[PDB]
Amino acid sequence: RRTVKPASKASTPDSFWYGPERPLFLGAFTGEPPSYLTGEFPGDYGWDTAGLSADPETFKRYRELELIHARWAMLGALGCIFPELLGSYGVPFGEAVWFKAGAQIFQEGGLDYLGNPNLVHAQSILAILGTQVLLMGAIEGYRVNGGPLGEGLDKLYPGGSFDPLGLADDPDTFAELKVKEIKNGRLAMFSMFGFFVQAIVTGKGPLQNLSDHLANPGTNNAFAYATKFTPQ
């Protein structure tokens, strides 16, 4: 066991995901990224082939959009996978598949959490919607403009009550966890786009889609649904 020495000698030997010598979205075929994607922000693989974020402030707003979409999409991926995953084990949901779980509010006994009548037992749609829009507006305006859990905090990484266990005290670990967050979230956004598309073309739950694929991968792939959207 030896004591690791401070970062005066070692300011950036670990900056693999930032700086000019950073991974890019085409690897060695990227060449050099645009002049504004310089590697200061997480997940910067130099992918701006459309130049939509050429302006710095539009780039900031797009970073905000991307990270918020990423967090919402991670929550959404886990929330579409978890009820179906536990519905494959014997937990009796009304509709464990995600693109049919919304209509559970039209059931006989209402929307039961974990299929349990003594749990939430929601019976109305627009009380759900009203409560949800009330609380979501409150907390989204808080995310926008201060609030009970932080006022002068950061826009995207406020911390404080949103970093209760203090995983962002180290700035190196913070810069690494930001890349981890944005990458897991881009993966979850891609996977939620997949959820949408392979729900539309297939109509089965994603975990059931995986079951069908691993039943016969050479047969049960997306090309088995290629002729479904043919004109007439």
Partner 1 sequence: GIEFYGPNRAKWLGPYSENATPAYLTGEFPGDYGWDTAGLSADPETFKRYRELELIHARWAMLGALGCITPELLAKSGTQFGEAVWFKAGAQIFSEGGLDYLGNPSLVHAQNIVATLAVQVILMGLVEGYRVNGGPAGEGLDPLYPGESFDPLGLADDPDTFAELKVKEIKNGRLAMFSMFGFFVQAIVTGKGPIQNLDDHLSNPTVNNAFAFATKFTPS
Partner 2 sequence: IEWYGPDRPKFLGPFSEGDTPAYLTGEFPGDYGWDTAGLSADPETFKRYRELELIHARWAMLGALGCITPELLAKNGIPFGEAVWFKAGAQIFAEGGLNYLGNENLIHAQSIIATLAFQVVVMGLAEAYRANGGPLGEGLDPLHPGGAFDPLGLADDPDTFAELKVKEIKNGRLAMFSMFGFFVQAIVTGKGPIQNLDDHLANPTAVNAFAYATKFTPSA
Binding site, by residue number, is 17, 25, 45-47, 53, 66, 69, 71-72, 102-104, 114, 120, 123-124, 132, 140, 143, 149-150, 159, 180-181, 183-184, 186, 198, 213, 221-222, 229
Least Å distance, CB 163 to ligand CHL, is 8
The DSSP call for residue 219 is T
Which residue in this structure is represented by tokens 């939509």? 52
Between residues 15 and 47, which has the closer beta carbon with respect to ligand LUT? 47
CA 145 to centroid of chain Cα atoms: 23
Cα 47 to Cα 29, 52, 73, 180: the distances in Å are 12, 10, 20, 17
Sequence-ordered alpha helix ranges (H) in 15-105: 56-87, 98-101
Q: How far, in whole angstroms, is CA 113 from its chain's centroid?
A: 23
Stretch that binds ligand LUT, among 31-39, 97-105, 143-151, 219-227 (CB under 6 A): 97-105
Q: What angle do CA 94, 97, 102 make, to 5 degrees?
A: 65
- Partner touching 77 among ligand CHL, ligand LUT, partner 1, none, CB below 5 to 8 Å by kind: ligand LUT
User: Please, which residues bridge with residue 111 across strands?
Assistant: 122
By CB under 8 A, which span of 18-26, 51-59, 72-80, 171-179 interacts with partner 2? 51-59
Q: Which residues bind partner 2 (CB under 8 A)?
A: 55, 57-62, 64-65, 99-100, 102-103, 106, 125-126, 141-142, 144-146, 199-204
